[PDB]
């Protein structure tokens, strides 16, 4: 009936999907034509968001759900079996996301109980889970990774490993992997008057002016900005407000165009003008 989230594969070859019928379908789009390939069923409740891991680790795809469990489906010659499962949270799991391929193969999941698990991968079918309790007050909805940024020796750098995240408390808390081993909330961002729906960490076009977008029940979209590296300054700026809720927000790769999904079943595109004010480039559909 109604799908929730669906994301294209890297190298634009597949297209995983999931709807409230608890079915994770992986289609294939060669030439523009859709063609199913498997219907990974396994959640006691509707699937929420879904994310493809980086081809550098073979072919992996994880899906979270209202069943409080998250699944990771590997692939070995067409063998789409699940190599690991994780039910570390008590309430539904609104979102998942993968850490930039350099950190390794880390997966971030925000539940509705107000927590956040982080599955790191080891040599074999093993997965450690550094968890964050009471991260948000009433639960969490969004989880986005901060772009992998590189900081005289034979070493792969230690990254700042940050990742933002909105929730039901209206706060968009940023986070960071403390040199010792656990994450801590580097900062809070309270600009929304109701539930934060989604939070997307725009990719850095090599540019140091890292941005982040958010949309919430109030129907406003903010593009929080940081003027320089290392200054704990996030100055929100209003994109627009619709009389209805905004459900999703995503960044287009090159221009940094924002796809604003929400309001009237309509989706909008925005590009920040040479003036600084954001505009609607067109109406989709």
């Amino acid at each position: 009936d109604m799908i929730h989230d669906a994301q294209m594969d890297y190298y634009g070859t597949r297209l995983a999907t999931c709807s409230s019928d608890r079915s994770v379908k992986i289609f294939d789009v060669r030439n523009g034509g859709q063609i199913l390939i498997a219907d990974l069923r396994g959640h006691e409740g509707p699937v929420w968001q879904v994310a493809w891991a980086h081809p550098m680790y073979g072919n992996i795809l994880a899906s979270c759900s209202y069943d409080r469990k998250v699944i990771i489906w590997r692939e070995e010659n067409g063998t789409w079996e699940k190599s690991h499962e994780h039910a570390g949270h008590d309430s539904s799991v609104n979102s998942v996301c993968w850490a930039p391929h350099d950190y390794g193969l880390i997966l971030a999941c925000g539940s509705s109980d107000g927590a956040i698990s982080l599955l790191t991968y080891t040599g074999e079918g093993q997965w450690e889970v550094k968890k964050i309790n009471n991260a948000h007050t009433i639960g969490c909805n969004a989880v986005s990774w901060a772009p992998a940024v590189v900081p005289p020796s034979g070493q792969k750098p230690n990254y700042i490993k940050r990742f933002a995240s909105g929730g039901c408390d209206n706060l968009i808390k940023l986070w960071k992997e403390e040199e010792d081993g656990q994450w801590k909330e580097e900062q809070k961002l309270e600009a929304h008057s109701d539930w934060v729906r989604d939070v997307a960490w725009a990719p850095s076009i090599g540019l140091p002016t890292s941005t982040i977008a958010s949309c919430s029940q109030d129907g406003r979209v903010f593009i929080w900005t940081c003027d320089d590296a290392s200054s704990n300054t996030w100055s929100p700026k209003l994109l627009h407000k619709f009389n209805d809720v905004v459900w999703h927000v995503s960044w287009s790769i090159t221009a940094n165009i924002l796809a604003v999904s929400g309001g009237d079943n309509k989706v909008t595109l925005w590009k920040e003008s040479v003036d600084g004010q954001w505009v609607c480039i067109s109406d989709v559909n």
């Binding site: 109604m2 709807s19 789009v29 859709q34 076009i205 995503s250 287009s252 165009i257």
Partner: protein
């Protein structure tokens, strides 16, 4: 129970639904209920709007002009011979777009003087040539406007004036001769003469506007022209501004202002200071940029934050030619910003090869590397198939980078080595 159960889930979730995120090669997908997947592969609209760009051959030809020197690590454009002139072939002569490129060329593109000369006067000769071409071109645009007006004019004298706007001295002189305005005819030939005759003439005008109970309106206008300062003097053809094209008036200044005393740029500036032009007019802004020679960049930013007459592509092309040419100086950062969105606009089009090429002209090495790298691997499949596309990787993509992306493709492909 299922029905009740479902409603149970929705309220707590506070669920209402619509979803959209960017796809990896920047497209957009939203929920179609009509497609079978329930996702729609949206072709992101392309802001970039230009026929030749799609065509692969222009990109290839464009590459030959550029000389790519390595950066230290990556590529980077070093000599570049891009000219606005080049674009013209790939454009309708009629199209206004062609007009912008053409005019930009006449002003901006370097002019070559075949004849050998002593030296310093070469600059002098070169300016005349450029001035000659530029003034000639303006006459082309003005021509229908002028001719229409002359056809309606019910006088002999006014047209003689009108021909002058046409920049045709001889015809005006002839008409004057025919009209019996013998004296005026002789004076007319003076036009195109920077001669100091201007002063005597201004004197005549002064004497007149200090008594002169009667002088023909048009005769005075002709005198205003020979004076050399048509719109900056007392007995101004400023009022004419409502009547004629701003361009038409500009020509008069260019043609009679005082060609020798001032440079083409300063002279144009001289005219521009007098009249304010539509901000939106592209052709007009170009003159500003041309005239603004001393703060070209400074003007550019305000042109940017005013109107969008300049397309994204043009801005980039303009910056690049001027920079390579040493015609003007522009901010490295400003130059890059210009490049980035162009590179992006191309990417949205799906013209990855062309988009990569542009990325090359990026001053920032760090940004370049990231931008080119990210694109190469993601897109590596398409880049391989043609020689034109072959040449692209051939530009200066590092070998490691090419195969490296290729390797990733294999793991995904499940056929490795």
């Amino acid at each position: 129970g299922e029905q009740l159960n479902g409603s149970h889930e929705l309220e707590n979730h506070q669920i209402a639904d619509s979803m959209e995120f960017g796809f990896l090669p920047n497209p957009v997908a939203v929920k179609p209920l009509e497609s079978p997947f329930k996702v729609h592969l949206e072709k992101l609209s392309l802001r970039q709007r230009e026929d030749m760009k799609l065509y692969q051959t222009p990109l290839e030809l464009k590459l030959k002009h550029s000389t790519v020197h390595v950066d230290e690590l990556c590529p980077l454009i070093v000599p570049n011979v891009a000219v606005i002139h080049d674009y013209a072939d790939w454009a309708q002569i009629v199209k206004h777009w062609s007009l912008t490129w053409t005019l930009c060329e006449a002003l901006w593109g370097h002019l070559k003087e075949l004849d050998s000369q002593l030296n310093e006067p070469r600059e002098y000769i070169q300016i005349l040539e450029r001035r000659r071409a530029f003034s000639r071109w303006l006459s082309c645009t003005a021509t229908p406007q002028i001719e229409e007006e002359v056809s309606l004019k019910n006088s002999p004298v006014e047209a003689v004036f009108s021909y002058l706007t046409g920049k045709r001295i001889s015809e005006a002189c002839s008409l004057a001769q025919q009209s019996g305005d013998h004296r005026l005819a002789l004076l007319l030939s003076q036009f195109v003469g920077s001669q100091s005759v201007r002063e005597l003439l201004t004197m005549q005008l002064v004497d007149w506007h200090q008594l002169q109970a009667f002088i023909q309106d048009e005769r005075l206008r002709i005198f205003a022209l020979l004076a050399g300062k048509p719109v900056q003097l007392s007995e101004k053809q400023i009022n004419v501004c409502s009547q004629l094209d701003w361009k038409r008036s500009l020509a008069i200044h260019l043609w009679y202002l005082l060609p020798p005393t001032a440079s083409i740029s300063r002279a144009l500036s001289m005219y521009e200071e007098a009249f304010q032009n539509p901000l939106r007019d592209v052709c007009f802004h170009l003159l500003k940029l041309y005239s603004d020679r001393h703060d070209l960049n400074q003007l550019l930013e305000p042109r940017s934050i005013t109107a969008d007459p300049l397309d994204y592509r043009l801005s980039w092309h303009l910056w690049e030619v001027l920079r390579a040419l040493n015609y003007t100086h522009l901010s490295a950062q400003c130059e890059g910003v210009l490049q980035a969105s162009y590179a992006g606009q191309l990417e949205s089009e799906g013209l990855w090869e062309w988009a990569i090429f542009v990325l090359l002209h990026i001053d920032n090495s760090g940004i370049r590397e990231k931008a080119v790298r990210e694109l190469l691997t993601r897109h590596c499949q398409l880049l391989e198939t043609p020689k034109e596309t072959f040449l692209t990787q051939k530009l200066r993509v590092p070998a490691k980078w090419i195969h490296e992306a290729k390797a990733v493709r294999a793991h995904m492909e499940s056929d490795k080595h």
